Amino acid sequence: GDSYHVNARHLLYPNCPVTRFPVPNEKVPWETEFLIYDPPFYTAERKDAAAMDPMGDTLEPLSTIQYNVVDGLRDRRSFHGPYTVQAGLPLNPMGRTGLRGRGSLSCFGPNHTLYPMVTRWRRNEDGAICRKSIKKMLEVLVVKLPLSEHWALPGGSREPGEMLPRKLKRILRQEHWPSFENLLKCGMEVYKGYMDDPRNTDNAWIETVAVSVHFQDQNDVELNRLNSNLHACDSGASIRWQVVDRRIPLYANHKTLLQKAAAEFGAHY
Amino acid sequence: QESLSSWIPENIKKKECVYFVESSKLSDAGKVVCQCGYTHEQHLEEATKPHTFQGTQWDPKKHVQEMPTDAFGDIVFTGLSQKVKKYVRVSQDTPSSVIYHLMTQHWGLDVPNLLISVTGGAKNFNMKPRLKSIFRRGLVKVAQTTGAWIITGGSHTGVMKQVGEAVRDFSLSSSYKEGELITIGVATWGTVHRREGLIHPTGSFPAEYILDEDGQGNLTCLDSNHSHFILVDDGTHGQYGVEIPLRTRLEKFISEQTKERGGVAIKIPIVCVVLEGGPGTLHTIDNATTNGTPCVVVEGSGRVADVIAQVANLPVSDITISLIQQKLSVFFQEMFETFTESRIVEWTKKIQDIVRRRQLLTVFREGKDGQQDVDVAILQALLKASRSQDHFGHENWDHQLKLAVAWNRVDIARSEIFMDEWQWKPSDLHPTMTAALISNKPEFVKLFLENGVQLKEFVTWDTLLYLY
Amino acid sequence: GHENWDHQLKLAVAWNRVDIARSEIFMDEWQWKPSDLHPTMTAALISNKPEFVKLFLENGVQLKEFVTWDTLLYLY
């Protein structure tokens, strides 16, 4: 059971009627010899536009930004390490994906995003923490988008630095109180680095930051004002708290963050 | 019923703290806790007075006091059954004769022929289904056909759950004498979840008690299938293990009363049966079998039972600390890293002292060999333990027969008592035959006639006068 | 939540067979309380399947607690 990016190796790239090359478990990494590898080069139709990198046809010398370094407004540098370059294109640091091109992602290499998680204990009617057979229960605040058919974590693309919470939660939190929760966004980190996703090509992948702000006391403090910072109904369906479980109905790769998040507190699974 | 509500607070006491000494460790939203922290700003429901001394480290010998009991009566579970279940709260230290006089007279229980003390792990677990069905059926069989008491902790978790499940299966059957299965449950009054609705003095004969799994903290809730409840109380909210120093004294006091029926009289035997268990259950097993009580372990489904099940046939001093180290690592495998090396020496000493006495300890060997059923295993273990007890003469063979005739079943006596190795003469059967004749058990009469007792030589003048 | 365990029971009662439900649905690992059986019992009562009624009574549903006024009006 070798841990390979099976969601990226999953066939039929989302929202684009192309297939990727069959990449078995042997020929995934770049160190392995794989002769018949012919990945079709595919980028999005709106991948040659603005803000995002125009390198959808990067055989042309337009691909000239700095690699594994902060190239201005695009900090094109991986958290994992210096990614290798071939023909002016980054290779995926985890293995072969069977599809070349920009995909629907913004820029090449990594694409840095930010995932915050809000964790609190689960109280009973009296005010004590509920429990599993041994461990305890955790509650997370989760957003349902009206056209997603999946509950997802309230984190978005980190196109700004500290407004990436606001870029996640312009529809969710506030505008005024959004600066106040941005002050509260300095908490504890869980995981940083490469993240599996079905929108990963051999050139563009996703890296993220998992910060974990936690509420110890379940009476007031940050918890009452964060509930008082509810200006929720802006451009979303619903938000609500949710108890943690393995069978938590969520987006697929988000549960891998929570399975790493409960180890930092000792919840159940 | 009014005589009981008179009698109970006149005789039995309970404990309570009178002195407020605020403890350091704040509880989970319970920061006002005065080293018991029960229900006040203080650990008190009395006058919050300085008590003429600021005595720090409030000693329970110095602080708490006894009072009459306000929590007795009858209970009924809200929405799970319609039967009623008696219950009482007792102090930490009451003399066991008082509790025995309560259970015989006022609750109306006859003196039992057998006392089964099941013990095991408090945490929940699971087992194979064939073993589960076999164990449930054998336990309900022996406790129904013998007229025995079943005594255990009355909580909803662990082994104490599963045995209650078996009792509920008999409530699925309920063929005849539905009140035959009487199970008592000994639990700590401090760690009962929704217990505040029970406290009503002068009798709470309807007492609705709801329950909710997972709607409770470290403290727990009761089981629903047990038939009587005894809650020992110390005066502490968050404390475990207060039930153990009373349960052993109660078992040892019950195991010395003599039941006399017909002409014969016996002392009530006691057996302990163990399941999956843990660390302290092994110490409890050793402390029980030191006094001469038998013990039956169950092969399979054991974090600590299967250790004894595997090591049972190796001889003494064959057991080494490396053997127990790899056995503990393969069977526990979760706390196995957490165990020090300063305690596996203790555990070698305990297991060597247990498997040294090959008489009282008995493995079950499920399925493989000698696996007739559960009940005949328990009864054969009890008879083997009574056989190896010391005796000046052949009165032990008379005692085994009196035990087998006190219980109703006759298959045991023809199975192994009358196998061989006694050379009894038929004049030595005239007492128990009388006891088989009064209590109307014709099977034992046929068995005694098959071993050749002469009715013309048996019915004297005085035996006839005694029969009338 | 535990609505999946309700859904498996509704599936097993939509099909006629009862051996599956007593075989593995009511094996263990649910800790259901008998107030959570009152909908499907109604569906077992209208469509005339007495086996599921006996199975629900063996798991201890109280008929005195079940037949309310409005449930009776719905049954008629």
DSSP codes of every residue in chain A: -----TTTS-SS-TTS--------SSS-STTS--TT--PPEEE-GGGSSSSS--GGGTTSTT--SPSSS-BTTB----SS----EETTEEPPSS---S-EEEETSSSSB--EEEEEEEEEEPB-SSSPBPB-SSSB-EEEEEEE-TTTSSEE-S--B-SSSSSHHHHHHTTTT-SSHHHHHHHHT--EEEEEEEE--TT--SSB-EEEEEEEEEE--SSSTHHHHHHHT----SS-SEEEEEE--TT----TTHHHHHHHHGGGTTB--
What's the rounded Cα separation, in Å, for the pair B39 and B237?
9
List phi, psi (to 5°) of B288.
Answer: -70, -45
How far apart CA A188 and CA B303 sit, in angstroms, is 38
From chain B, the residues in CB contact with A124 under 8 A are: 215-217
Q: Which two tokens stand for residue C75?
A: 């049954």
Distance from C-alpha of B236 to C-alpha of B216, rounded to nearest angstrom: 17
- Is residue C58 within 8 angstroms of chain B, CB to CB? yes
User: What element of type H or E holds C12?
Assistant: helix C3-14
Q: Which residue of B has its CA nearest to C24?
A: B129
Q: In what order do the strands lie in the sheet with B228-232?
A: B208-209, B73-77, B85-90, B228-232, B182-188, B148-152, B114-119, B270-274, B295-296, B361-362
Out of A128, A130, A133, closest to residue B29 by CB? A128
At position B429, the amino acid (one-letter code) is: L
Beta-bridged to residue B21, according to DSSP, are none
Spatial separation of the C-alpha atoms in residues B93 and B145, rounded to whole Å? 34
Environment class of residue C72 by beta-carbon count within 10 Å: exposed (0-12), middle (13-18) or buried (19+)?
exposed
Resolution in units of Å: 3.3
Point out the residue among C28, C31, C60 whose CB comes nearest to the CB of B213: C31
What 3-state class would DSSP assign to B401? helix
**Interchain proximity A131–B214, CB inside 8 Å:** yes
Give the Cα separation of B440 and B463 in Å (integer): 16
According to DSSP, residue C24 is labeled I
Q: CB within 8 A of C67, min separation 6: which ones?
A: none
Choosing among B26, B28, B123, which should be mutated to test the A contact, i.e. which has the most A CBs within 10 A? B28
Distance between C11 CA and the closest CA of chain B, angstroms:
25
What one-character DSSP code corresponds to residue B112? P
3-state secondary structure of B403: helix
Q: Are A168 and A114 in contact (CB under 8 A)?
A: yes
Three-class DSSP category at B78: coil
| Residue that has been written with the tokens 């014709």 in this structure | B442
Buried b (16+ CB within 10 A) or exposed e, A235-260: ebeebeebebbeeeebeebbbebbee
Query: Do C71 and C40 form a contact (C-beta atoms < 8 A)?
Result: no
Residue B229: in which H helix or E strand, if any? strand B228-232
Q: Is B28 on the interface with A (CB under 8 A)?
A: yes
Smallest CA-to-CA distance from B433 within B452, B417, B411, B416 is with: B452
Confirm if B360 and B385 have CB atoms less than 8 A apart. Answer: yes
Stretch 210-249 of chain B: residues touching chain A, C-beta under 8 Å:
214-218
Residue in the block written with tokens 């680095």:
A193
Placement of tokens 């699974």 in the chain: A269
Q: Which residues of C touch B172 (CB under 8 A)?
A: 58
* Cα distance between residue B87 and residue B98, in whole Å: 15
Q: In sequence order, which ranges of B129-190 are alpha helices (DSSP H)?
A: 129-146, 159-173
The residues with which B362 forms a beta bridge, in sequence order, are B296
Q: Per the annotation, does A199 bind a ligand? A: yes
Annotate A64-100 with b (16+ C-beta within 10 A) or e (fewer).
Answer: ebebbeebeebebbbeeeebeeeebbbbbbbbbbbbb
Cβ-based neighbour number of residue B3 at 10 Å: 9
Minimal C-alpha gap between A131 and chain B (Å)? 6
What gap in Å lies between CA A128 and CA A148, rounded to an integer?
35
Tokens 């009469």, located at residue: B445
Q: CB–CB of B354/B308 below 8 Å? A: yes
List Cα–Cα distances, A7 to A20, A248, B166, B199, C55, in angstroms: 12, 19, 48, 59, 44
Task: Compare CB distances from B215 to A124, A133, A219 and report the shortest one's residue.
Answer: A124
Q: Give just the sign of the alpha carbon dihedral A21, A26, A28, A34.
A: negative
B234 CB-side CA count, 13 A: 20
CA-nearest residue to A217 within chain B is B29
Which of A122, C36, C33, C6 lies closest to B215 in space, CA to CA?
Answer: A122
| Inter-residue contact B41 to B22 (CB < 8 Å) | no
Tokens of B112: 């039992």
Q: Identify the closest residue of chain B to A123 by CA–CA distance.
A: B215
- Contact status of A128 with chain B (Cβ, < 8 Å): yes
- Identify from B77, B80, B161 which residue to disrupt to test chain C contact, counting C C-beta atoms within 10 A and taking the largest count: B80
Interface of C with B in 5-24 (CB under 8 A): none
| A166 carries a ligand binding annotation | no
Identity at A27, one-letter amino acid code: K
Report the gap between the CA of C67 and the closest CA in chain B (Å): 14
B334 touches chain A (CB under 8 A): no
DSSP state of B302: -
**Which B-chain residues 347-386 have CB contacts (< 8 A) with chain A?**
none
Helix (H) / strand (E) containing C71: helix C69-75
